[PDB]
């Protein structure tokens with residue numbers, strides 16, 4: 001951090017204790033966040049931010065550089081050919097993908113499958129030129145279980161059929177049981193701490209995203225506070241996805257959020273499930289047929 005203009009050893013310590021350890025978090029921080037660090041003037045705050053931006057080469061980009069920026073996005077397979085195809089390759093890092101649908105449609109299943117697939121190196125599609133092995137090495141997932149439906153057995157089972165060690169998935173998956181939106185949001189924010197602790201978080205799951213909010217802000221007369229809180233939460237999830245180049249997944253029970261990809265999943269005949277991609281920035285609306293068996297997501 002002392003590389004940063006105006007940042008000496010003493011300021012560097014105040015910065016590390018305030019959570020600001022890497023350049024990107026400073027380069028993208030507001031003069032407000034830092035000035036609040038106390039002992040950090042607004043002058044020093046603006047200088048180090050300007051400095052960090054330069055160090056991280058933030059600025060106008062054009063031509064081939066646009067393709068290169070886009071290439072830093074890696075993708076996680078869902079184990080369903082149909083789905084991956086409709087996703088334009090697989091779940092995208094640096095973005096939030098939402099799977100909404102009726103109870104039993106398979107939302108939680110997809111969440112578990114993703115935690116497993118993260119441990120299958122061949123399931124992470126990326127341009128070796130924009131993303132180095134080390135960046136996706138020893139990947140870890142964080143699962144914010146809001147409904148209390150995380151099932152280690154299911155992880156073990158899906159892993160087995162994938163030919164990978166189930167215990168290895170468990171060892172690399174942090175689960176956080178949230179009983180309300182406050183815990184849910186806080187846990188989400190604490191993810192930076194796990195990364196700071198050396199954990200290569202590459203997959204974040206929020207299952208579910210809206211349950212707590214709906215239960216807490218049932219009154220549609222105070223739908224204001226709710227739509228707000230949820231917005232801040234989503235903003236936090238999106239920033240996480242970008243800064244730490246990781247895949248963020250959230251589920252929504254349904255009988256509009258800031259998710260960059262939005263799916264509506266419905267039950268087909270028996271095993272069959274239909275995932276309808278209805279919102280994305282560059283892909284056409286399309287349906288993917290897959291199934292849910294003892295092996296997890298397949299087809």
Ligand SMILES: Nc1ncnc2c1ncn2[C@@H]1O[C@H](COP(=O)(O)OP(=O)(O)O)[C@@H](O)[C@H]1O
Pocket residue numbers: 101102103104105106107108109110154157292293294295
């Ligand atoms: N071990 C399993 N083997 C085959 N299918 C399973 C297994 N576990 C769960 N399922 C399927 O998952 C469905 C429920 O998926 P779930 O993700 O919990 O729904 P939701 O969308 O509400 O989260 C079940 O009704 C069952 O068909």
Ligand SMILES: [Mg+2]
Pocket residue numbers: 094095096238241242
């Ligand atoms: Mg993004």
Ligand SMILES: [Mg+2]
Pocket residue numbers: 107108109147149
């Ligand atoms: Mg569920």
